[PDB]
């Protein structure tokens, strides 16, 4: 039920036989969800299960497209200032961020993401905290202070 | 090719070197030593532009040939030895000991030191590692590795290392009543007791230092130096005594001669 690829997800280091699943406290002030701690998903690139260790910086953004498998797109709305006219002005850049299956992602929700070691061609970030934010209109159009 | 670089232009001489613009084209790049290049000076500069013992680099070389200069009570010969943040340099031909101190103005200055207190150097350990068979070693800013430290010593404490035996004597911790120097801060050269610390989650931690004139400033946790506890600064501070002197009333003092 948990493996269906042409391979098996090993969950490195979790041990199988001696003892007395594996999960980490990640630190940084975020908490491990009970869903992640009592789930059955197996992954290598999961922030809370894999070999990664979040270090670097922390960003926040919106979900745009969750259609992929285990990857989502995060855009970073903010304001940019111009020295000539002395008025702030809008400017944005999106960034592909990996998602663990323990988190349910929906379009428009506010997500916090942390920096991780290069994981794909241009995916270098992993989601940590997700809060439910409803949307009206288009997620692409919608802008928030974050 | 793109190998390790081997020159430093005179304009690109480090900040505290105080070298003239037209006096040539290049400043010496210190060989890989016990301290960072950005925060240490070569003995050539130290004995030339401060001690004024010689007038040419080759004269300095002829001085260095005789085994007269000593660092940490042992012999050194290469003209590119960065002295480092804290140490003792001995000259036996005149039986004089110098110790590197800072100024409230942000530089390096040698300080005359008597023989008794010249045998004590103070080193802040930078890392604590564990080796095979449970032996704990400490790596200092001095580029020196001290094995078999007490379990008492923590990461930020300072250790009274002896120069000759290469062994520890005592530890000094970091309460709000411990004298601490600032290494490379923009307010470098201030001696204080530190009012308190401020630990930040996963970032730099900022510590507040209080002075003898009730002035309070803040500094990054990385570049502090435990120099002694509330009793006294254990080693001899320079003439300015490590208290930073305000600019206008400093001009007043300079004018009143």
């Amino acid at each position: 039920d948990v493996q269906h690829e042409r391979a098996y997800q090993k969950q490195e280091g979790a041990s199988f036989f001696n003892s007395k699943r594996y999960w980490k406290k990640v630190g940084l002030g975020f908490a491990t969800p009970k869903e992640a701690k009592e789930g059955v998903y197996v992954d290598k690139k999961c922030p809370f299960t894999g070999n990664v260790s979040i270090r670097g910086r922390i960003l926040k953004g919106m979900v745009i497209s969750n259609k992929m498998k285990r990857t989502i797109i995060i855009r970073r709305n903010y304001l940019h200032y111009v020295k000539k006219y002395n008025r702030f002005e809008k400017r944005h850049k999106n960034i592909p961020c990996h998602c663990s299956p323990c988190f349910d992602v929906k379009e428009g929700d506010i997500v916090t993401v942390g920096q991780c070691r290069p994981l794909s061609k241009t995916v270098r970030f992993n989601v940590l905290h997700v809060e439910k934010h409803q949307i009206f209109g288009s997620a692409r159009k919608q802008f928030v202070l974050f | 090719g793109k190998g390790i670089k081997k020159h430093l232009k005179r304009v690109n001489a480090p900040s505290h070197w105080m070298l003239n613009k037209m006096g040539g084209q290049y400043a010496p790049k210190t060989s890989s030593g016990p301290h960072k290049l950005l925060e240490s000076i070569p003995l050539v500069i130290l004995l030339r532009n401060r001690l004024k013992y010689a007038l040419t680099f080759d004269e300095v070389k002829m001085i260095l040939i005789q085994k007269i200069v000593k660092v940490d009570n042992k012999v050194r010969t290469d003209c590119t030895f960065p002295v480092g943040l804290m140490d003792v340099i001995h000259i036996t031909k005149s039986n004089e000991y110098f110790r590197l101190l800072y100024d409230i103005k942000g530089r390096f200055v040698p300080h005359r030191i008597t023989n008794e207190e010249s045998k004590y150097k103070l080193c802040k350990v930078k890392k604590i590692l564990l080796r095979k068979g449970r032996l704990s070693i400490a790596v200092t800013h001095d580029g020196r590795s001290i094995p078999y430290i007490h379990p008492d010593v923590k990461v930020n404490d300072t250790v009274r290392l002896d120069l000759e035996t290469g062994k520890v004597l005592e530890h000094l911790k970091f309460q709000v009543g411990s004298l601490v120097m600032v290494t490379a801060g923009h307010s470098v050269g201030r001696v204080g007791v530190i009012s308190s610390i401020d630990k930040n989650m996963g970032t730099y931690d900022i510590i507040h230092v209080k002075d003898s004139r009730n002035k309070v400033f803040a500094t990054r946790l990385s570049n502090v130096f435990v120099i002694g506890d509330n009793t006294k600064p254990y080693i001899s501070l320079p003439r300015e005594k490590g208290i930073k002197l305000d600019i206008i009333e400093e001009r007043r003092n300079r004018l009143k001669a």
Partner: protein, 171 residues
């Protein structure tokens, strides 16, 4: 060979400068097969010699159930999650499935526990019958083309269930 000369994120193509610097490198592929033991040494960056195995025969192998290892030699290659060509050509890779002898492990079991640390683990009938056959499955774990030698762990439990179920509703 590593970091340029391909399209960008948005979909365009970047203009090319910065003639290839050597430290990108990208050494030519090395393919290790089954035969007589023979290895080569490669002058890796920083004078760190790297062992490139070209023909391997034997190495280390481990029971995870008892947490033990015993030297032996591989027999045949039967499956890999990667492309089918590497298992049809009898080569070795990091996460491949191969066939091993049973006699050294059986002799160790007899000398240790008797009968044909933390002992008394009750083993399993499915692996018991495979041992009775005498040629068993095992999954390689190390990288032969990196370490110059082979090592793997014998497959047990639902892992072997999945492997063998894909092996043989079956052809």
């Amino acid at each position: 060979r590593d970091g340029r000369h391909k399209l960008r994120l948005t979909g365009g193509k970047k203009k090319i400068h910065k003639k290839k610097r050597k430290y990108e490198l990208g050494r030519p592929p090395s393919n290790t097969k089954l035969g007589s033991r023979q290895v080569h040494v490669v002058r890796g960056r920083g004078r760190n010699y790297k062992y490139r195995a070209i023909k391997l025969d034997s190495g280390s192998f481990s029971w995870p159930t008892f947490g033990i290892s015993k030297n032996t030699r591989i027999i045949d290659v039967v499956y890999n999650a990667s492309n089918n060509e590497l298992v049809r050509t009898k080569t070795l890779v990091k996460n491949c499935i191969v066939v091993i002898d049973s006699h050294p492990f059986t002799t160790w079991y007899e000398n240790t526990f008797g009968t044909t640390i933390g002992k008394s683990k009750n083993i399993d009938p499915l692996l018991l019958e495979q041992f009775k056959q005498g040629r068993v499955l095992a999954c390689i774990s190390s990288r032969p083309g990196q370490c110059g030698k082979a090592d793997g762990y014998i497959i047990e439990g639902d892992e072997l269930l999945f492997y063998k179920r894909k092996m043989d509703k079956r052809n």
